[PDB]
């Protein structure tokens, strides 16, 4: 799968028209230490009881979905669009 880095398409934020967008790949981002769930888990793990929550081990998949990140160039607002799961994926390459 090869995808170009720019794309003219419909904008759904602040200008309901076709304009020019930029295309990249979305990344997960790191879990932050002060979120409510992580504080709950960290307080539960203290004391004298061993592990308190499940830990997954039966991995089966070998790919991930490839959600794209668009961004209007007139207004600077951003939107997500998802694709089908694949193995190799390039953002801007040589044509066939």
Which residues, 30 to 59, sit near RNA by CB under 7 A? 30-38, 41, 50-59
Considering the rule CB under 7 A, would residue 91 count as an interface residue with RNA? no
3-state secondary structure string, the chain?
A: CEECCEEEEECCCCCCCEEEEEEEECCCCCCCCCCHHHHHHHHHHCCCCCCCCCCCCCCCCCCECCCEEEEECCCCCEEEECCCCECCCEECCCCC
Considering the rule CB under 7 A, would residue 73 count as an interface residue with RNA? no
In the bound state with RNA, the residue whose beta carbon lies nearer, of 46 and 88, is 88
Residue 15, binding choice from Zn ion, RNA, none, Cβ under 5 to 8 Å by partner class: Zn ion
Chain contacts with Zn ion (rule: CB under 5 A): 11, 15, 72, 74-75
């Amino acid at each position: 799968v090869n995808v170009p880095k720019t794309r003219k398409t419909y904008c759904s934020n602040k200008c309901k028209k076709h304009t020019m967008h930029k295309v990249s790949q979305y990344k997960k981002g790191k879990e932050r230490l002060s979120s409510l769930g992580r504080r709950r888990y960290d307080m539960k793990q203290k004391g004298f009881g061993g592990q308190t929550k499940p830990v997954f081990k039966k991995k089966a998949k070998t790919t991930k979905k490839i959600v794209l990140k668009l961004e209007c160039t007139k207004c600077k607002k951003k939107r997500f669009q998802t694709m089908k799961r694949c193995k190799t994926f390039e953002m801007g390459a040589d044509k066939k």
